[PDB]
Amino acid sequence: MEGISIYTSDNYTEEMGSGDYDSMKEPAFREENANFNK
């Protein structure tokens, strides 16, 4: 979370813009055996 810094100069050359794949999530730092959703 710490906004220390990024790379001094990425200057990112975008390869593509893309358009999503499947489900998304947030870290829970724990295993998950209780529910499945999409």
Binding site: D10, E15, K25
Partner: protein
């Protein structure tokens, strides 16, 4: 070479979930106004995809990298 248009994310849409068995490798690139932009290249499926850095397998990968 205007590669960085503005304070925008390289990937307009990100690929969440994805198959970690279908991935080549990851690239962590962080533009100064976006989350930890991780982009991973597909072995054979389409092309290179942008991965959500909040994915459980991404977390695991990051976490286990400290160990391995």
């Amino acid at each position: 070479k205007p590669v960085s248009l503005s304070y925008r994310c390289p990937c307009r849409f990100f690929e969440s979930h994805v198959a970690r068995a279908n991935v080549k490798h990851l690239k962590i690139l962080n533009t100064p106004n976006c989350a930890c932009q991780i982009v991973a290249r597909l072995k054979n499926n389409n092309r290179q995809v942008c991965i959500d850095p909040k994915l459980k397998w991404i977390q695991e990968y990051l976490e286990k990298c400290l160990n391995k």
